[PDB]
Design a protein around this motif. Sequence first.
Motif, PDB file in Angstrom:
ATOM      1  N   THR A 351       0.832  -1.197   0.000  1.00 15.47           N
ATOM      2  CA  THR A 351       0.000   0.000   0.000  1.00 15.47           C
ATOM      3  C   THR A 351       0.868   1.250   0.000  1.00 15.47           C
ATOM      4  O   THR A 351       0.626   2.200  -0.774  1.00 15.47           O
ATOM      5  N   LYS A 352       1.934   1.265   0.792  1.00 10.27           N
ATOM      6  CA  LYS A 352       2.861   2.418   0.771  1.00 10.27           C
ATOM      7  C   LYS A 352       3.519   2.530  -0.610  1.00 10.27           C
ATOM      8  O   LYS A 352       3.642   3.640  -1.112  1.00 10.27           O
ATOM      9  N   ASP A 353       3.891   1.391  -1.192  1.00  6.82           N
ATOM     10  CA  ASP A 353       4.539   1.421  -2.507  1.00  6.82           C
ATOM     11  C   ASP A 353       3.608   2.003  -3.557  1.00  6.82           C
ATOM     12  O   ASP A 353       4.040   2.781  -4.405  1.00  6.82           O
ATOM     13  N   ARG A 354       2.322   1.631  -3.519  1.00  4.90           N
ATOM     14  CA  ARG A 354       1.384   2.123  -4.520  1.00  4.90           C
ATOM     15  C   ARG A 354       1.180   3.626  -4.379  1.00  4.90           C
ATOM     16  O   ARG A 354       1.078   4.341  -5.387  1.00  4.90           O
ATOM     17  N   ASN A 355       1.134   4.125  -3.135  1.00  3.56           N
ATOM     18  CA  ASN A 355       1.009   5.570  -2.925  1.00  3.56           C
ATOM     19  C   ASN A 355       2.252   6.332  -3.378  1.00  3.56           C
ATOM     20  O   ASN A 355       2.147   7.441  -3.923  1.00  3.56           O
ATOM     21  N   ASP A 356       3.437   5.771  -3.123  1.00  2.00           N
ATOM     22  CA  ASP A 356       4.684   6.472  -3.402  1.00  2.00           C
ATOM     23  C   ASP A 356       5.037   6.444  -4.880  1.00  2.00           C
ATOM     24  O   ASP A 356       5.541   7.440  -5.419  1.00  2.00           O
ATOM     25  N   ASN A 357       4.797   5.309  -5.533  1.00  4.23           N
ATOM     26  CA  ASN A 357       5.445   4.995  -6.796  1.00  4.23           C
ATOM     27  C   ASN A 357       4.491   4.736  -7.945  1.00  4.23           C
ATOM     28  O   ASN A 357       4.961   4.389  -9.030  1.00  4.23           O
ATOM     29  N   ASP A 358       3.179   4.879  -7.751  1.00  2.00           N
ATOM     30  CA  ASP A 358       2.217   4.854  -8.864  1.00  2.00           C
ATOM     31  C   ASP A 358       2.259   3.541  -9.633  1.00  2.00           C
ATOM     32  O   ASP A 358       2.373   3.519 -10.861  1.00  2.00           O
ATOM     33  N   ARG A 359       2.176   2.437  -8.904  1.00  2.00           N
ATOM     34  CA  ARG A 359       2.252   1.124  -9.529  1.00  2.00           C
ATOM     35  C   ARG A 359       1.568   0.124  -8.609  1.00  2.00           C
ATOM     36  O   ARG A 359       1.411   0.363  -7.406  1.00  2.00           O
ATOM     37  N   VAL A 360       1.175  -1.008  -9.181  1.00  6.81           N
ATOM     38  CA  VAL A 360       0.534  -2.091  -8.435  1.00  6.81           C
ATOM     39  C   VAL A 360       1.134  -3.427  -8.861  1.00  6.81           C
ATOM     40  O   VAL A 360       1.348  -3.676 -10.052  1.00  6.81           O
ATOM     41  N   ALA A 361       1.413  -4.282  -7.885  1.00  8.95           N
ATOM     42  CA  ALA A 361       1.823  -5.648  -8.171  1.00  8.95           C
ATOM     43  C   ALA A 361       0.639  -6.480  -8.653  1.00  8.95           C
ATOM     44  O   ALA A 361      -0.495  -6.310  -8.195  1.00  8.95           O
ATOM     45  N   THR A 362       0.915  -7.421  -9.561  1.00 10.57           N
ATOM     46  CA  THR A 362      -0.147  -8.272 -10.082  1.00 10.57           C
ATOM     47  C   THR A 362       0.046  -9.768  -9.852  1.00 10.57           C
ATOM     48  O   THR A 362      -0.872 -10.538 -10.156  1.00 10.57           O
ATOM     49  N   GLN A 363       1.184 -10.208  -9.317  1.00  7.84           N
ATOM     50  CA  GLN A 363       1.421 -11.627  -9.089  1.00  7.84           C
ATOM     51  C   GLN A 363       1.946 -11.836  -7.673  1.00  7.84           C
ATOM     52  O   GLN A 363       2.785 -11.066  -7.188  1.00  7.84           O
ATOM     53  N   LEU A 364       1.433 -12.864  -7.009  1.00  6.92           N
ATOM     54  CA  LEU A 364       1.876 -13.250  -5.675  1.00  6.92           C
ATOM     55  C   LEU A 364       2.646 -14.552  -5.801  1.00  6.92           C
ATOM     56  O   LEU A 364       2.108 -15.549  -6.303  1.00  6.92           O
ATOM     57  N   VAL A 365       3.904 -14.544  -5.369  1.00  6.82           N
ATOM     58  CA  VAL A 365       4.724 -15.749  -5.361  1.00  6.82           C
ATOM     59  C   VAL A 365       4.780 -16.253  -3.932  1.00  6.82           C
ATOM     60  O   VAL A 365       5.085 -15.488  -3.013  1.00  6.82           O
ATOM     61  N   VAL A 366       4.481 -17.535  -3.744  1.00  4.83           N
ATOM     62  CA  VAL A 366       4.490 -18.182  -2.441  1.00  4.83           C
ATOM     63  C   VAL A 366       5.591 -19.222  -2.478  1.00  4.83           C
ATOM     64  O   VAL A 366       5.612 -20.085  -3.368  1.00  4.83           O
ATOM     65  N   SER A 367       6.520 -19.127  -1.536  1.00  3.70           N
ATOM     66  CA  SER A 367       7.628 -20.063  -1.465  1.00  3.70           C
ATOM     67  C   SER A 367       7.679 -20.643  -0.064  1.00  3.70           C
ATOM     68  O   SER A 367       7.425 -19.944   0.923  1.00  3.70           O
ATOM     69  N   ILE A 368       7.940 -21.945   0.007  1.00  2.91           N
ATOM     70  CA  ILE A 368       8.135 -22.609   1.283  1.00  2.91           C
ATOM     71  C   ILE A 368       9.365 -23.499   1.200  1.00  2.91           C
ATOM     72  O   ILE A 368       9.860 -23.837   0.117  1.00  2.91           O
ATOM     73  N   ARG A 369       9.797 -23.888   2.413  1.00  2.36           N
ATOM     74  CA  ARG A 369      10.883 -24.880   2.579  1.00  2.36           C
ATOM     75  C   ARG A 369      10.347 -25.913   3.574  1.00  2.36           C
ATOM     76  O   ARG A 369       9.766 -25.511   4.580  1.00  2.36           O
ATOM     77  N   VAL A 370      10.462 -27.196   3.243  1.00  3.41           N
ATOM     78  CA  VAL A 370      10.014 -28.264   4.121  1.00  3.41           C
ATOM     79  C   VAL A 370      11.221 -28.804   4.869  1.00  3.41           C
ATOM     80  O   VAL A 370      12.358 -28.758   4.389  1.00  3.41           O
ATOM     81  N   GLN A 371      10.964 -29.305   6.071  1.00  2.00           N
ATOM     82  CA  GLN A 371      12.032 -29.748   6.953  1.00  2.00           C
ATOM     83  C   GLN A 371      12.781 -30.926   6.338  1.00  2.00           C
ATOM     84  O   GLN A 371      12.171 -31.894   5.875  1.00  2.00           O
TER      85      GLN A 371
END
Length: 430
Positions: A351-371
Amino acid sequence: GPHMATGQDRVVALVDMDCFFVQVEQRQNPHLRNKPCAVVQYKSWKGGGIIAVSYEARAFGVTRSMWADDAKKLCPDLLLAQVRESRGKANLTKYREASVEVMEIMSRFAVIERASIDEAYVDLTSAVQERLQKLQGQPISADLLPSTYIEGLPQGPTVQKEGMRKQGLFQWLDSLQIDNLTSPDLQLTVGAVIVEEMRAAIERETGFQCSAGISHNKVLAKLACGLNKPNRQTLVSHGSVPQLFSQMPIRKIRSLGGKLGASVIEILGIEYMGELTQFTESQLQSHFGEKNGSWLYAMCRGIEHDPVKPRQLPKTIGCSKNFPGKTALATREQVQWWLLQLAQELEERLTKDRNDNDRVATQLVVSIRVQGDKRLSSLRRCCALTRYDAHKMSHDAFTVIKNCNTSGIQTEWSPPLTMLFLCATKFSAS
DNA sequence: ATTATGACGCT
DNA sequence: AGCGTCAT
Ligand SMILES: Nc1nc2c(ncn2[C@H]2C[C@H](O)[C@@H](COP(=O)(O)OP(=O)(O)OP(=O)(O)O)O2)c(=O)[nH]1
Ligand SMILES: [Ca+2]
Ligand SMILES: [K+]
């Protein structure tokens, strides 16, 4: 001969903030200034993990990756500042904001490439041409270069560091040809004048000191920056490359500090960057691939073409947390709670980035590591990022990772999760 | 049990 | 797209 390009067409600087997170904390807390000081993340396990070290503390052997308890064995008077914790995790906002301060000042002088939170490349070619035109043949005074080292000088036919620095600078300036506006050495020198001004502006307007390198490309400017830290800048000329590289371990060159550099050493039976000159371009391409081979062939001669990209903002905004050993996440309630914590930090930052820099992210990357997985990421999955809403973001992340739960019970999670990572990517103008 | 990032190359 | 490398 007259046709062999020499890679002297640009003036590139690399500006790196000295021990950056330490300086941010020392600005905030004067009691930490001019002291052996380090910045730590967390505290319960072995005193916290050190991530930044003042030069006074480095003299005692304190380093990044050290546990604070061990650092205190080397330096019992070491002062520590702790990274902020929000929503149960390290929160690096203070350092990101300080980085924006510095990057905005640098951008007044030239277009910059944000390489890291505290590092930026500068293409000074045009600013140098302008300053040369303003000069009109007038020579460059050593007073315009009060913190500049010329790598490789003095040479040929005092016992204090500053005296040596000035001896080398005088040899350099004496050899200059300030009449030829197309002279690469002169262009580099004017570039160094500009970087002195840039560094003075950063320190005046933020309190932060930095080092810099000035050369003809990004790799040499980076290497140059490292030669005289802290609070100094270094000019690496094209002519300085043979001697510099003749004793330069291959791993010191950016991109060769890992497996590829180790294979250059093992396959070719060499140690130093300069030894690469004995191989043909085709030989190097045969061992290391077409791109790496061409890059090594030119690099070992001081030549690199990678442009300074006009990019002052990060391309991704990410949030991640490790859950080591016995803290690994083993219940669905746990996984969901931490995904929500990460997603709430991500929402705030986006939200701060969108206010400051006039842009929006469109993809969410989810990464995990298993034990039990040696790799850093055990799994990466993308999904659409259509709204800056933490609950939606964490529910989507759970949906894309839920099949990885081997447990037959829905309440339990196995194998336990040792890392969660949410990253917003693919920005569009808004 | 380093950790929290971020860039970019490969296929 | 998902994975690996490099950086620190
Ligand atoms: N969270 C985290 N931050 C790191 C890590 N490594 C470095 N940083 C942060 C803290 C540093 O102040 C900042 C810049 O990194 P650098 O490698 O440029 O070192 P620094 O500026 O501390 O020292 P320098 O004078 O450049 O040698 O990045 C890390 O592993 N984890
Ligand atoms: Ca730095
Ligand atoms: K840096």
